[PDB]
Symmetry: C3
Subunit: 99 residues, 3 copies
Amino acid sequence: NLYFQSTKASLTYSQLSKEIANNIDTMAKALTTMQEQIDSLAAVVLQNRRGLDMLTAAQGGICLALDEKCCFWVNQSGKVQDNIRQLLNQASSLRERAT
Amino acid sequence: TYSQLSKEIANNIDTMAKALTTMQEQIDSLAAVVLQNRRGLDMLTAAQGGICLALDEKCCFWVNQSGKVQDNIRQLLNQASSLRER
Amino acid sequence: TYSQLSKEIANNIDTMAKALTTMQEQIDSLAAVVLQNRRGLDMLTAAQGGICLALDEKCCFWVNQSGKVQDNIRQLLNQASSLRERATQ
Ligand SMILES: [Cl-]
């Protein structure tokens, strides 16, 4: 009698962890696609920057022409890619245990 | 324990789906400014045939993927709804 | 088990919040470069009243939502925290 209640509970947690694993996978897809868009947008931005620096070359670039502290992009694609790989590993580990 | 944990997961998926929504909204919003900036530079170097020819560089284009992200959000909201119904 | 699952869920929440924090940092970093690029173009077309008037186009402005994202990140870190507290009891 105690066996059946513990196995019915074990089955619910096995099924619940399979759902969590599918939610994690969906979240990893979303972050991958968003990082791809950030990487894509950044290359356009940096080319726009080089373009503005060329047009103001005699003034020493756009930041000196604007008389401002220069803004630089901080690429962090590697760390986001690591966060995604960790989520993908956490999901496969849960899907493994539940089976 | 259970159903409480199931509701807590769905609450977490919801705040996740919302975070991704406002993140995609910012990408879309920034991209429009960048594309208008590009048209601005292509206009200023119209004689040379645009900014990429004036720079003597392979041109960069943004690959918009909002639809794929919006679909992931939809799927996340369907996943949270399932855990609440059961 | 209940406690081992909520401890796994909370670790996953921490990874998501970490991913969103890094993603928002990059958006904020990139946006400062694009708004300086816009100020650069408005300076170059100052006689025409800016790049939007020079292009004769509806002007695009960036809608900054970092605060709203940072609010959701804090909400996630509280959910991971509560799941860890409830895992013991
Ligand atoms: Cl730009």
